[PDB]
Amino acid sequence: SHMEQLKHCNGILKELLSKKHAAYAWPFYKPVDASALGLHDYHDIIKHPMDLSTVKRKMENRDYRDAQEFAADVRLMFSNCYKYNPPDHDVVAMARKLQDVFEFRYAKMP
Numbered sequence: 001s002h003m004e005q006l007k008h009c010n011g012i013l014k015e016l017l018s019k020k021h022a023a024y025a026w027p028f029y030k031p032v033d034a035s036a037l038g039l040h041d042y043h044d045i046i047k048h049p050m051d052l053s054t055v056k057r058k059m060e061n062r063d064y065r066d067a068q069e070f071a072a073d074v075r076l077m078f079s080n081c082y083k084y085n086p087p088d089h090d091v092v093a094m095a096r097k098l099q100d101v102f103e104f105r106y107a108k109m110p
């Protein structure tokens, strides 16, 4: 059922924000601060920024109708990272590590 799916999505998000994954999850906790970092073209390349704090809000306020909507936002956050950055950048490697955690937990959802 849809409500059961979202309860499991809450657990996945809790796992992505947990201390065990912090070494690679931290660049995704908050929006990219393009202005402070001097990434002048970030909002030109990334039309729909996404981060775990936004996913946390949409989950708390029940803005996701189903698990697929939650998965779309999480994957959009990783896709933005792959889209913007060169493949050798440390953040791209951190995103792949966190995405392996998300994809595993999302696939194992009962």
Ligand SMILES: CCNC(=O)c1cc2c(-c3cc(S(=O)(=O)CC)ccc3Oc3c(C)cccc3C)cn(C)c(=O)c2[nH]1
Pocket: 026, 027, 028, 030, 031, 032, 033, 034, 037, 039, 080, 081, 084, 085, 086, 089, 090, 091
């Ligand atoms: C081609 C150029 N790319 C970028 O400099 C770039 C930066 C980022 C960051 C990012 C956001 C912050 S923050 O201060 O905003 C909040 C924490 C701080 C560091 C960040 O990255 C770094 C990381 C993760 C490790 C070492 C060095 C840096 C600059 C996030 N994400 C998701 C990106 O895609 C992205 N790209």
